[PDB]
């Protein structure tokens, strides 16, 4: 859980518990080609690997074999009219790999299923305002 204080651990303490978890996940379509066994999650910055594993397994009942994480740096370079910098937020990315031989594929989320006036001026009129009949 994010932004909370954690109890200081010493020898023989109660197993740490969090009843209402504070994190939130995004499942994102991979920007590059990756094997069928890999899924990709942007997570919040303060989340550890072990956390993402347990979070995935217990909330969603996913059998995860492997997790890896990196931190993405958002550009500092775009400037305001005041010429002060806009910073896009930094964000953590995790790669998970499924244990039971399961293949994922990113669902196409947009199936495409949905639910002639010519007033052009007369070439032979020579600019005469046609509405007027005579």
């Amino acid at each position: 859980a994010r932004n909370v204080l954690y109890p200081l651990y010493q020898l023989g303490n109660p197993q740490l518990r969090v009843f209402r978890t504070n994190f939130f996940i995004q499942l994102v379509r991979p920007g590059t080609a990756q094997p069928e066994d890999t899924v990709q999650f942007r997570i919040p910055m303060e989340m550890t690997r072990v956390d993402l594993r347990n979070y995935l397994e217990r909330i969603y009942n996913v059998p995860v074999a492997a997790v890896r994480t990196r931190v993405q740096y958002g550009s500092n370079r775009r400037r305001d009219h005041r010429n002060i910098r806009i910073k896009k937020p930094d964000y953590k990315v995790a790669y998970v790999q499924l244990a039971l031989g399961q293949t994922f594929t990113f669902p196409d989320l947009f199936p495409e299923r949905k639910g002639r006036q010519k007033h052009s001026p007369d070439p032979r009129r020579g600019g005469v305002p046609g509405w007027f009949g005579l």
Partner: peptide, 9 residues
């Protein structure tokens, strides 16, 4: 989470 994902997508 489901909403967030749809957002990004």
């Amino acid at each position: 989470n489901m909403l967030l994902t749809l957002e990004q997508e």
